[PDB]
Design a binder for this molecule. Structure first.
Ligand SMILES: Cc1cc2nc3c(=O)[nH]c(=O)nc-3n(C[C@H](O)[C@H](O)[C@H](O)COP(=O)(O)O)c2cc1C
Ligand SMILES: OC[C@H]1O[C@H](O)[C@H](O)[C@@H](O)[C@@H]1O
Length: 147
């Protein structure tokens, strides 16, 4: 199957997660294209994949990264019925609205018809060894749900 991952990372923590998850998936007989939101992908590309993984830190007052806002708006005009999807991100418990970018992106995927196949994966700040193992489990479980 043909998969896309679109991630946002300012200080590298969500990027580390993305690279682990994608590297695990690449060891299966599935293709994955990993795109940084800073490179401005158009949301319509999500219609052309079998599975979709989004990664995002949380910003401001429980908000999406600024660089995700246009893409998020454009998601209201795409049809993701049938696709399999999941979301991850780095988080900080010094904020009350912890990791809610993950929850916001899950909600939008649901509204557009995607089958969200995993709970949101939230890691505090920089992954430690156990968090990297959770990234492995997330990639492995995502693949199981494909066909
Ligand atoms: C201005 C600012 C606002 C933030 N807002 C939140 C927030 O509401 N909730 C949260 O969990 N983290 C929040 N964070 C923490 C970041 O999500 C956290 O540092 C994360 O590890 C960044 O991931 P990254 O390294 O991929 O950029 C905020 C950080 C900054 C600088
Ligand atoms: O693409 C726009 C339309 O897509 C789907 O029909 C949604 O269910 C509907 O709410 C939205 O207005």
């Amino acid at each position: 199957s043909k998969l896309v991952m679109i991630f946002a990372s300012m200080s590298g923590n969500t990027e580390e997660m993305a690279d682990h998850i994608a590297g695990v998936i690449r060891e299966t007989e599935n293709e994955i294209e990993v795109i940084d939101i800073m490179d401005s992908p158009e949301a319509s590309i999500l219609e052309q994949y079998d599975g979709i993984i989004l990664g995002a830190y949380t910003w401001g007052d429980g908000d999406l990264p600024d660089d995700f806002l246009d893409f998020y708006d454009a998601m209201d005009s795409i049809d993701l019925t049938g696709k399999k999807a999941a979301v991850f991100g780095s988080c900080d418990s010094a904020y009350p609205k912890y990791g809610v970018a993950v929850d916001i992106l899950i909600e939008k995927l649901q509204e557009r018809g995607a089958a969200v196949v995993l709970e949101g994966l939230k890691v505090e700040l920089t992954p430690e060894d156990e968090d990297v193992e959770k990234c492995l489990q997330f990639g492995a479980e995502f693949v199981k749900h494909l066909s």
